[PDB]
């Protein structure tokens, strides 16, 4: 079931969360035209292991072969880094990192725009981030997860985009993917009331085109069925007495770390 974190658990999650955010801050300058995703993966891994003295939660997970997930353009999620995949001007790329420190996980991701942005790419990234922020603002004890998924969907669809149904946010802590499943759309199947001490991620995947997706032969890579662009952002949070605290906040986030209701 849903694990409630103790204060000591939470302290450890703050550290892991900050470490993960830091990998994202760190990598920025390397994201340029001509770099391969395989190289980005190596830089991230070295940092995690050698500087942070932490470990990547992805390496070996269900056999995943790399340290982070890098998803370019039409890839929705779980893109596998490769020395042969080079970034080009206009690409939009998601880098999703999950670090383990002292047994606790920190999971977060953001989009990067390579070189000169395209109109669609910039728009898509912006809207996706805003959808995540909207959701964060709603988190508080007593509310049903359903309301959050419904809000994300309505926002996104109003902007002419679609939300991916298949992949979702999830509880996180000592475990990588714990209960509950955090859907990014309205579903009558969702019935979970939030309570303080719950820790989970919100990580909406939004497509420029239609919602349909397709899993590749590698068994990890997911792409949009219509080849439209897809974007995603993710944060790990903790439900507090009157709101929430964002554990993976970065310098570039424009939302406050602690959100309070009253
Ligand atoms: C190769 S497993 C990677 C899982 C992602 N961090 P998701 O946001 O749980
Ligand atoms: Co992630
Ligand atoms: Co996640
Ligand atoms: Na993408």
Q: Which domains does the chain have, with CATH numbers?
A: 1-262 (3.90.230.10)
Q: How far apart are CA 104 and CA 10, in angstroms?
A: 9
Write the DSSP string, 7-64.
Answer: HHHHHHHHHHHHHHHHHHHHHGGG--TT-BHHHHHHHHHHIIIIIS--EESSTTGGG-
**HSE-up of residue 135 (Cα within 13 Å, Cβ side):** 35
Virtual torsion, Cα 223, 185, 20, 38, nearest 10 deg = 0
Plot region of 109 (φ>0 → left; ψ -120 to 50 → alpha; else → beta): beta
Distance 147 CA to ligand 1 centre (A): 24
234 marked among binding-site residues: yes
Atom number, ligand 1, closest to the C-alpha of residue 177: 9
Q: Is 203 in the pocket of ligand 1 (CB under 6 A)?
A: yes
Q: Is 69 in the pocket of ligand 1 (CB under 6 A)?
A: yes
Q: Is 58 in the pocket of ligand 1 (CB under 6 A)?
A: yes
For the chain, the C-alpha Rg in angstroms (whole number) is: 17
| Shortest-distance Cα residue to atom 1 of ligand 1 | 58
Which residues lie across from 240 on neighbouring strands?
A: 243
Q: How far apart are CA 56 and CA 60, in angstroms?
A: 9
Q: How far apart are CA 152 and CA 143, in angstroms?
A: 15
Which residues lie across from 231 on neighbouring strands?
A: 206
Burial 125-153 (b: 16+ CB within 10 A, else e): bebbbebbbbbbbbbbbeeebbebbbbbb
184 marked among binding-site residues: no
Judged by DSSP in three states, 168 sits in coil
Write the DSSP string, 197-240.
Answer: T-EEEE--EEESS-S-EEE-TTSS-EEETT---EEE-BEEEEEE
First vs last Cα of the chain: how many Å apart?
Answer: 30
Burial 93-112 (b: 16+ CB within 10 A, else e): bbbbbbbbbeebbbbbbbbb
157 marked among binding-site residues: no
Distances (CA, A) of 232 to 53, 102, 163: 27, 27, 10
Q: Which residues contact 48 (CB under 8 A, 6 or more apart)?
A: 19, 23, 54, 55, 56, 67, 99
Q: Which residue has 């986030």 as its token pair?
A: 253
Q: Is 101 in the pocket of ligand 1 (CB under 6 A)?
A: no
| Shortest-distance Cα residue to atom 2 of ligand 1 | 58
Judged by DSSP in three states, 104 sits in strand
Atom number, ligand 1, closest to the C-alpha of residue 203: 8
Q: How far apart are CA 26 and CA 5, in angstroms?
A: 29
Distance 57 CA to ligand 1 centre (A): 9
Residue in 229, 231, 226, 233 with CA at minimum distance from that of residue 210: 226
What are the tokens at 185? 């759309």
Contact 203, 109 (CB under 8 A): yes
Distance 133 CA to ligand 1 centre (A): 20
Q: Which residue has 């999950």 as its token pair?
A: 98
Give start and end residues of each alpha helix (H) in the chain.
Answer: 7-27, 37-46, 119-138, 145-158
Atom number, ligand 1, closest to the C-alpha of residue 66: 1
Instruction: List the resolution, Å.
Output: 1.7
What are the tokens at 245? 């605290």
Pairing status of strand 235-240 against strand 199-202: antiparallel
Q: How was this structure determined?
A: X-ray
Distance 109 CA to ligand 4 centre (A): 11
């Amino acid at each position: 079931a849903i694990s409630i974190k103790t204060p000591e658990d939470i302290e450890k999650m703050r550290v892991a969360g900050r470490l993960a955010a830091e990998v994202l801050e760190m990598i920025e300058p390397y994201v340029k035209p001509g770099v391969s995703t395989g190289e980005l993966d190596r830089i991230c891994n070295d940092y995690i292991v050698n500087e942070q003295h932490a470990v990547s939660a992805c390496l070996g997970y269900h056999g995943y072969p790399k340290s982070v997930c890098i998803s370019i353009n039409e890839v929705v999620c779980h893109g596998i880094p490769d020395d042969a995949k080079l970034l080009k001007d206009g690409d939009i790329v998601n880098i999703d990192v999950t670090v383990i420190k002292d047994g606790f996980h920190g999971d977060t991701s953001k989009m990067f725009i390579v070189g000169k942005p395209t109109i669609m790419g910039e728009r898509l990234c912006r809207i996706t981030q805003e959808s995540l922020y909207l959701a964060l603002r709603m988190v508080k004890p007593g509310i049903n997860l359903r309301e959050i998924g419904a809000a994300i969907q309505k926002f996104v669809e109003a902007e002419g985009f679609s939300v991916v149904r298949e992949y979702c946010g999830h509880g996180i802590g000592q475990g990588f993917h714990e209960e509950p499943q955090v859907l990014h759309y309205d579903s009558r199947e969702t019935n979970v009331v939030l309570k303080p001490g719950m820790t989970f991620t919100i990580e909406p995947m939004v497509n420029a085109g239609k919602k349909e997706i397709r899993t590749m032969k590698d068994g990890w890579t997911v792409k949009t069925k219509d080849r439209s662009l897809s974007a995603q952002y993710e944060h790990t949070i903790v439900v507090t007495d009157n709101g929430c605290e964002i554990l993976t906040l970065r310098k570039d986030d424009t939302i406050p770390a602690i959100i309070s209701h009253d």
